[PDB]
């Protein structure tokens, strides 16, 4: 068949044209980098003719960006069973997220400058209601994973990077005045949905790629689907990064609100939910260890999945550290009475045995380095 | 009275406006027959006169405009809008001529855009079809729900188009003068109806190039002048009118996108010609030049050994200019693509005065100015305006998302493609309305025409882009869910819903994968479909999973657990439909257990080999829910498989225990056969889950454990007893009449074949004594019977055929293998 | 009977219990381990009790005599009972938390522990998820219970359901008492009916179920809509809708206030019409915007069409029908020619009202889906006559 | 039954023949006087072939009796018309039909 593979000139023009369309899409259109996010955000932030009005100031008419945020907050607050998927919402959320960061030793002044620019670009949003919109959409998702919640979390991370105390305070004031349980309910459900390593999926993927049939169209060996193992790693890391950024800067108010919500009828301990996810993760890692224990050298996909799991575990560890730093004594006591000790015991076992095993081969050096950083 | 007295007679005004609402409702969403009927009560002259009547109240004016649209335009506009999202481009001289930028003195990349909605469009859109209104015609003899669907009533479209343009221009001019007596009492009631009509007619395609130019001049003459009057955008209009303006602008932006897509397709035609010629010449010159170098000859020939798509990728990989040298193509051919890419970026506005000079700038500035001027109170308007702003700022992404709906075809497939598109439009229309007999007939007939079409098989990617399978599934499920528990209606439609979708997975692997992605939905809808006979969503799932190792290995334990739960429910409770039919009440549903079991068989057994990942899961789930095994194989208080088969045979002999015993369908269920088939399917599935030998020789603990579990479940003596069980044989008796067994109610050789497969895969035949025992008890007698039936009278009997199949498929290969 | 059950019963009212310490003074004090108390079921007014014959049940207050109905919360199952605690004036020590403390319920006199019955086999075959609650000497380890707070809305609604059920059942009982017994030229010969209380309850509940004004902001309006839908669902699940239907059914047999008086007296005949209108308005309030409650009428839609003609509450019945049809497509798929013809006869007999046209429009399309049968029936029966 | 009365006379010689297309303007009323159809509102003459059975029995026979340029009133019983089933929405069951027909030309 490889010899029989027809040359291009022998195909009908229309098939070849469709092939050309796909190839051109991938190589040229997709690769092309055009930045319109910041220009859009500025053009929508600017307000006009209010200088000639001179009363509309005292009126406080929303500018276009504020109106857009209000529209999406309206959609969130609308009472209905499910959060409908909105490509417009996700596109605009991505635009705002890009606007914030908008981005070998650097000067202290430059570094403060970058902080100030980032704070300005975050203000453009949280003055207009982005934090409240983020919380509303997280509550609306009702604990169902999806691109909507992913975009909302990315937006929250963008506005919260650097430990923005203003966004922090606004989020907390909103949550405490509304006294709604749906937010933390959705957080808990999303945590439960967050995945861990599956050795059955790993084996199935290995066998699939070993079979390696050629795809009926042309010839595509080892055609790759979505990674069955930790497909939602980015979502898990974004969720825990958002929770970490809430408490960033040693904000005791969040550090305690996450543990308990006094005003609400019911409360959820995100600290303990995080510990539970960590325990599940370390169980998965130990099982995957035991799978690879006999074999002298770990293969490439195993290295990759180890790297993914260790990145997730690192983000979880940083979130747990941020929950207690400052310190937050209540969170300290909760963890001390939690199963974090069991998690640490398992992680220590895996750390030691992988350390010894990976020291033997230099091909495993990068994974060893990642493991050590995680320890 | 004069209808104009309703300006003061308000109760009558409300009643008549709501009467118009009712007229629109009864004809809503495809009731073209009701539209024809309405054409009698509200005639064309009335409607046209109302369009121009300045003295009507706004409610009546809007009601009559919307009634005209509903009766005459709504179905056509909806059908056309369904297609507008897709871009099927024929490869034609017209397409070749298409360019992103018209020709002229300025360079195309730096040039001013051509006017939107004006020019050549080659994308395929099926024509509109209308039927004249007549009420003296002969009444069809054909019955209701069988007669063909009626077309929308006809009205003179060019005259309506001219009148709409004229009224819109008049409205623009008078709004320029700011009269104190607007038509309908408001700028809203003056403008909104006309704009809705104009938008409908644009989407329908009635407007020509010059008419589009006049509309553009009304919108903003300065921008759309081709080489004082005030434009709607300057008229300072309320929000609803702004919404209609936004819809018009959306149409024009969609036309710009469509032009981009068509220009890309034309360039692909022209450029593929050159690339093909270059490849031919280069292969050629390589053949003249193979002598000098062997290895480097090998390296170029790697190109011609590459698949065509990879050849394309290699040829086009010269963007960075760092891979220029490795790219074989010459600089002229490269430069053609580079020039087109620059022109495309400019047309999309990536390439970088107060007066806009372009649609993108006009739209962006208008939206921003509106939001700056006022705090919009309409969420729909907010959504629309911000969508337009997004499109103007990101045109490349819009094209990038649209292309997946772009497909180039030869002009010779145009007519078949158009027929297929009409059928797909019918099917899409059937989504909104509730199912009925007429809709079922239309659906079945459209499916049949599509399946007869050759394009369906030749261009499966086109169908996947079109979403044909998804629409079919949506129709099927909308029928399934409604009143599911009580009874399942329109079963013929669901049977067609496979025949289509359930050959669809066979056409191509990509189609099969697409349906595999929807698998869970099919499984959760399977529960009701079980009682229905024929092709079912469970069969769609089986087609999705069949003979594909990738899909089987990607199959989910959640789906397997759902199937096993269904089967446990079947093994625990009987079929209410059979109970209502009066069948004897047993405790379980063999009929559905069998379907779930064969689905699992297709899941676990692929291309002659077991998939251990799914097999072990099935075994574990089944033991955890052992009621799936049957009232037999239960354990405590459970008769064996052999006793179950014997009791089933006695049942088949005895009526009032095999059936109601008080069939037109002739598919009347026989409980003995149902039980035997359930158990045979179970045994077959277990044997298929059985490990392959090479693992056993390797000594894999999981394989050994699974095999031991299977052996514990099914003892060998019972298998041998079933294989030894006699099978009734056709006889000739009593005047030479054939006494002949009935398959649907009798023990059959397939039941034996399942047991043989189990024996071979699990226990195996390793000893001569056991081999001879099986031969003397079960196999040899059946071979003797088949050979005895090898007579002219008996050769073609269904029993003889079944015996031959059983032998060849199960027995004879086994004897061949055990020959030593 | 008492069950451990999961699902929507959690959000339902029947799962709501009130703790009543045996002391009247300082009954709002913090609960304390070993503190004797009664457990009351809000929607029924019945008290958890141990009965020698039927064991654990809920009994009436008259039968609640502090030996059957006295329970205590214990942190652990050990039989310490070292010293009876002294009664404390004031709120006292804060011992038991909401949602953290694990409590074992003990019947003080017997000392038995609240536990489940360990469902007998074949219950899994039934798929029955509810576990009968019993009192047993040892019990099980998992017998501990978290205590979860309820919203003021839910507590109020449960109490109001209890009182409303009592009142309306008394009303119905009176109506049944003089159903078939004409008073002649005499008195109705029975206890006075609670007309004034019924009227005031109906008015109060209509105000309770009033939908929010459109002027309101979007967020607050959505919150009010959530509250209203929840309250509607709770009332429905406790059966107020069926009670209203029963009351209307019994009041409908009497065509007019005079016909009612022949059995009840003029004093109630005056309020007959007001009561029927109030009942229909309350029905509309309960089902308005609630798809499930409107769908309940699919089985019995003739219950409304048969009454459309009645003159006393024509507008109320029509509004009920309008709400049902806007909300529920099931009703639309079950519609029939008889129903459509009755609605058209309503136009013929009662006059040109655009509300009937709105109802007919709703019959055609629901949630973007058209019903061809209804469309064609309306066309065929209404249009051709042209009167 | 078809029942033809001359509103205005035609030529009196030229009569439709089978296989000959008749061009008409018509206005349709029920016996009570309610109008359900008119070609003039559409502003388009209605064309039909004789013996083909496009139009109802009444039109066939009545136009067979007419002359070019003739205007006539045609009364058609239900049995020649749509009859018991009727034309849903437009024409009720068992409806006598009155038509005003002008026979413009033959083609």
Author numbering:
A (entry chain D): 3634 to 3736, 3749 to 4020
B (entry chain D): 1648 to 1874, 1922 to 2046, 2088 to 2397, 2410 to 2567
C (entry chain D): 244 to 630
D (entry chain H): 1 to 107
Question: What do the study's own words say?
Answer:
pmcRyanodine receptors (RyRs) are intracellular calcium channels involved in the excitation–contraction coupling in muscle cells and in calcium signaling in neurons and other cell types. Caffeine, a xanthine derivative found in plants, has been used for decades as a pharmacologic research tool for activating RyRs, and its functional and binding properties have been extensively described. Mechanistically, caffeine stabilizes the C-terminal domain (CTD) which is responsible for transducing the Ca2+ binding signal to the S6 pore helix, leading to gating. Here, using cryo-EM, we explore multiple xanthine derivatives and related compounds and identify 4-oxopyrimidine/2-pyridone as the minimal motif necessary for binding to the xanthine/caffeine binding site in RyRs.
